[PDB]
């Protein structure tokens, strides 16, 4: 069990039972902060590169371009370093000094777009750079690349099945790209044949999934739950496998993450707090009190030292 | 495989083969950054509490006091939160705002001693607080508590044995408390019966182990390799199992950690760079070129964002 590079070391993350949430230990958390670049995104960083290799879209000498600076940026950085690709991340110039340092530490060519243009600015500049030499550059496109949900169907989902001896009844996951809830749901429902409850979590401030499913007007909004609530339905969210959508507000997500830290001794990020607050609500409805709820904790606390978490 | 609390989730950390160090992949690294509070110290945080419980020195209602603010502080914080102990960490007032936040986030009662007194200040204030109500307070004493090396003999060492199919020939570990190299060495040498080379790593700036073994004057000095080079021989370093001592300088340790990041896609801390630089030196001596070298990487990169690493 010696990994040929850090990308192969993804996953096999542990399940920890919560003591101050749920009812009689019915809430269990999967610690994705424990991964090579310390997030759930390590899985999709690995698999999107591996898949682009297998299909010939990524070869030696081609460069990677992606418009983000979040967990996926960090994940692609570690994989790119491990496997010998130059990586360019586009992002506004107004981004955190510390994220600049972390990504620069990881050997990323940083392209700081117009700050005023912001995120819009970066997506376009990605598209621009790729357009300039399409035989040289590849955008992996985390929101729509099937290799994203697929890695969750092959690793994250089976790990949950295994670790719970098939007892998992509910999976709660915040939605960013939708890959985690999609892949996990496909594994447990379709590969293992259990009719679990798949619960998507989104900020109450930007409840676009809830609005869409209700046939209401879609109204995205700003929030602090980093990693989720992109303000649209990503292609990698398979609405067909979602049984329930829970909304959580920023303050509750923050307070919940602090409780995870101070009361559970679990070093989780902001989205982790959101996912647990939603899980806790379900766990205290009599319909779910004899059911085993598994919650994805996407990242770790130290990535949030500059944020409202502290 | 559901852990009753986060303390039980320690270890089972992966081995990753380096590509830009050693010779023909003879250097393999054990990623301790992957643990509940993201350091090797999670193991000793867990076991020192468990052991003090088993022997009756720690009971419900007793409080924990320890004079550090490093990885052991963070480890004891997570375990204390998980298991329901109040924890007081002593430390100078001049400590990092970010470490204050991280530990305060973890629910630690912080006792900020005289800054001018510094570390000396904190050890005494620990002793003071314990003295004031010895039936209330327990100091676990990481430098001398046998539960420190013991957890490495029962977990870290066997994991290395298992993962390498007994092929490990050399273990390289930086020495802070000495627990890692001691416990690992005892496991592999005494429990599994293999005559490996145990290599302690210390800063060239503070080479007290090298000086002691040479019967030279012991001359501690300041350095930047955080986590190692305490400036004395800790009781938890069993000199009897050490075959070799390698010294590394701060700049080399830093540059090596940056290479781990940029060239290997491994997010390691400063001590990780020191341990790899020493391992690389041995790996390129013909006497070790057909030998499998395993290197402890004690911590992860984001804990060092405020430091010289970046």
UniProtKB/Swiss-Prot annotation, chains A, B:
Binding site for pyridoxal 5'-phosphate: 71, 176-180, 271
Gene3D superfamilies from the UniProt entry: 3.40.50.1100
Entry keyword set: Allosteric enzyme, Amino-acid biosynthesis, Cysteine biosynthesis, Pyridoxal phosphate, Transferase
Superkingdom: Bacteria
One GO CC term on file: cytoplasm
NCBIfam families the UniProt entry points to: cysK (TIGR01139), cysKM (TIGR01136)
Protein name stated in the entry: Cysteine synthase
């Amino acid at each position: 069990a010696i990994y040929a590079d850090n990308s192969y070391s993804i996953g096999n993350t542990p399940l920890v039972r919560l003591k101050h949430f749920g009812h009689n230990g019915n809430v269990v958390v999967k610690i994705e902060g424990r991964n090579p670049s310390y997030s759930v995104k390590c899985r999709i960083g690995a698999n999107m590169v591996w898949q682009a290799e297998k299909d010939g879209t990524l070869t030696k000498g081609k460069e990677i371009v992606e418009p983000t600076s979040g967990n996926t940026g960090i994940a692609l950085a570690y994989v790119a370093a491990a496997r010998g690709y130059k990586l360019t991340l586009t992002m506004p110039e107004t981004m955190s000094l510390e994220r600049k340092r972390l990504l620069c530490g990881l050997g990323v060519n940083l392209v700081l777009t117009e700050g005023a243009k912001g995120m819009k600015g970066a997506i376009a500049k990605a598209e621009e750079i790729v357009a300039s030499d399409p035989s040289r550059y590849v955008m992996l496109k985390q929101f729509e690349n099937p290799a994203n949900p697929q890695i969750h169907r092959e690793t994250t989902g089976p790990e949950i099945w295994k670790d719970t001896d098939g007892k998992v009844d509910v999976v709660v996951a915040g939605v960013g790209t939708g890959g985690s809830i999609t892949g996990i749901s496909r594994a447990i429902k379709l590969d293992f044949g259990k009719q679990i409850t798949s619960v998507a979590v989104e900020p109450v401030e930007s409840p676009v999934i809830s609005q869409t499913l209700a046939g209401e007007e879609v109204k995205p909004g700003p929030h602090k739950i980093q990693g989720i609530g992109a303000g649209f339905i990503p292609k990698n969210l398979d609405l067909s496998i979602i049984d329930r959508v829970e909304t959580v507000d920023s303050d509750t997500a923050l307070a919940t993450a602090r409780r995870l830290m101070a009361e559970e001794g679990i070093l989780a990020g902001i989205s982790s707090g959101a996912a647990v607050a939603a899980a806790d609500r379900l766990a205290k409805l009599p319909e779910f009190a004899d059911k085993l709820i598994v919650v994805i904790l996407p990242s770790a606390s130290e990535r949030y030292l500059s944020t409202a978490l502290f």
